[PDB]
């Protein structure tokens, strides 16, 4: 039950339009910083802050370079099922 | 051909615990009724047939054959998904 509680909550997560939008561009570039994520996006940048910080910790992994901040994906389930939807 | 929509929505609808047994099962069994997918949860109708309902037309399949209605996967994303999540 457990494999399927966490795994439900993987979905929850990305079934967003935008956070799949963030992982795929996460994932065909591996890892980027906001400023980053925002200039591809083209969006408000709380809009991308809140996407960022609610996968935080299931779906994308944050590590710090200097005074950036950058996001990858956590998981390779979530790289699986990005991919196979585009 | 589906949209950024469509694949959010796709997972928010499989993003619930008995909602991937369910598809798992299928993807397993190739078809089952409502009364096998009872069985085979050990939950109440009144549980399955609402996750069916929701379900329907986005994740899975309805069919009809004499009497008898039977659920199955056609969806290519949702087969992929489920395989990876096992």
Chains 1, 2 share one sequence.
Do not use: F, W
Request: charge should be positive; hydrophobic fraction near 40%; charged fraction near 25%.
């Amino acid at each position: 039950y457990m494999s399927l509680e966490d795994d439900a909550e993987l979905l929850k997560t990305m079934a967003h339009p935008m956070r799949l939008k963030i992982v795929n561009e996460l994932y065909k570039h591996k890892a980027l910083n906001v400023t980053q994520i925002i200039q591809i996006l083209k969006l408000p940048q709380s809009t991308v802050s809140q996407h960022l910080c609610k996968m935080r910790g299931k779906v994308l992994k944050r590590n710090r370079q200097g005074l950036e901040i950058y996001y990858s994906i956590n998981n390779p389930k979530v790289e699986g099922i990005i991919k196979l939807l585009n």
